[PDB]
Amino acid sequence: ESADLRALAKHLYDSYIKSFPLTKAKARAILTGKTTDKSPFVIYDMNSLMMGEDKIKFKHITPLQEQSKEVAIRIFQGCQFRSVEAVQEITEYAKSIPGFVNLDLNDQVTLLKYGVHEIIYTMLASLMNKDGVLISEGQGFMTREFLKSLRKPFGDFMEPKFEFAVKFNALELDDSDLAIFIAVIILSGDRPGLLNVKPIEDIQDNLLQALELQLKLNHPESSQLFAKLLQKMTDLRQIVTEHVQLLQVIKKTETDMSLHPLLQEIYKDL
Amino acid sequence: ESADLRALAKHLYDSYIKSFPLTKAKARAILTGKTTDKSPFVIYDMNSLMMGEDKIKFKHITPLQEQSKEVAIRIFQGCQFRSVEAVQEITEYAKSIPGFVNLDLNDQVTLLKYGVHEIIYTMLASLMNKDGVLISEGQGFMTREFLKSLRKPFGDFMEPKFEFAVKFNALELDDSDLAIFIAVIILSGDRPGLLNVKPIEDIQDNLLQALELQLKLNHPESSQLFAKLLQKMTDLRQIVTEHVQLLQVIKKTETDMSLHPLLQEIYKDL
Numbered sequence A, B: 001e002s003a004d005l006r007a008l009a010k011h012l013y014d015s016y017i018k019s020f021p022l023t024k025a026k027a028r029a030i031l032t033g034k035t036t037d038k039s040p041f042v043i044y045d046m047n048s049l050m051m052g053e054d055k056i057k058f059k060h061i062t063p064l065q066e067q068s069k070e071v072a073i074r075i076f077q078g079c080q081f082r083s084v085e086a087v088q089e090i091t092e093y094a095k096s097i098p099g100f101v102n103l104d105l106n107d108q109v110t111l112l113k114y115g116v117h118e119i120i121y122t123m124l125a126s127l128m129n130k131d132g133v134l135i136s137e138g139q140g141f142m143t144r145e146f147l148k149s150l151r152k153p154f155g156d157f158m159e160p161k162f163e164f165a166v167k168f169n170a171l172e173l174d175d176s177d178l179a180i181f182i183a184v185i186i187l188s189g190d191r192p193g194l195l196n197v198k199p200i201e202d203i204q205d206n207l208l209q210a211l212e213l214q215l216k217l218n219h220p221e222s223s224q225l226f227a228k229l230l231q232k233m234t235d236l237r238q239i240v241t242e243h244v245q246l247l248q249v250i251k252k253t254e255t256d257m258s259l260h261p262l263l264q265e266i267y268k269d270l
């Protein structure tokens, strides 16, 4: 029954709304310089960074940064806080995925471990446009050009994501689509270490079935979007890859940089 | 019209058969399958290979192991020769895909330059089984165990493909299926350097449609198969990547020699 698949489609979209405070809808409303019910403060240079804390919730330093964790450090030390924020949110979303919690407790931890970052960059796309990304729950907007100018080892930490996002937003997907897509990325099954893969692939077929019907109904005139979407899962993989090696490089250049525990566990080698 | 998709499917199948000597139906019969009437020459040990590179229709170097060239090197160089062969077969194949020859010459070359590898490891999976891969038009069978006992740099060269193949073969696809899959791969619109992505994506959109129908009809019980195959293109990618990784390492082994100029010339980087 296709009626059963729409139900699951609605269920996941519902938890999607409940677990992510900043949807793609809100993001675009904020990004398109029209709905000015509340516009973002822009960050495109150090001077703006200063003023940044002024009208934005920033527990970081406001004045000089050179002799006190420079802009680069400040920004990514904050970038960590959000990354964990995202994990916890996704972890919560994951629990609402039918069958997920019923899987082996180990397998839950393995699916989260490998999927939590592919989803982050997917959604991160919702907060981006060719020129920059939304920060502090849509309250701010940091320029891509600013981010690319950061210190030699931090400057190329985001660029590869902007590129991912520009072509991925082209698909023009929305939250109800993402909800199912994000639920397909978790219930994969080819993740390294999974014990019982069959019970997992049984859920993904279900989710995949849901995502398909969803895409057809929701984008009738968009030929093979389903396949075009699924192929994007590869683009994600690569990105996670370049990220970790970039992370492995920081760990050596900044002996004082502290990677948060939760993120340390998730990440491994090879 | 289901008439055009079936027409392309067939057309592609026919061109696949006429382009590839060893089909999967064939390889499969020679492999774990029975169909005994000309058993292949197994290669499981240094004596097995030695006593084979002389009794087999191989064209490169004769078996000699006594302070005169290594076993692993001669085996690696074997893949090159054969791959280069494959590359010519695939190019002749791509040329029969509706639209391909009409693309911008530079675009054609580009699509091939990056698709050949993914295609190679895909089709290799046909010749592979859990315990080894067919060698020499199917005249032989080099074991997987012997490949892993190879030199330090080479003992981890085919294991990642063995792992890929085993998971890939589970899909239980057949030549008629791979004819279309392969076409989808070459018609990749994200290949770096392309000049006019529109036409290339147009043909792939069409191919992807054909694959989808071909699958539903060819495997009515295999659920959501179309989706699972498209997800294997991610593994291919990582295989293809990781492959170039163990290549540079090799590049830091055998190099400077005035006799390779013309031989090494025939083998670029693909």
Ligand SMILES: O=C(O)[C@H](Cc1ccccc1)Oc1ccc(Cl)cc1
Binding pocket: A076, A077, A079, A080, A082, A083, A086, A120, A157, A243, A247, A250, A257, A263
């Ligand atoms: O490595 C990670 O898991 C996060 C992921 C992330 C990146 C950008 C926005 C949100 C999360 O990126 C980081 C990159 C560098 C640091 Cl010093 C900390 C985190």
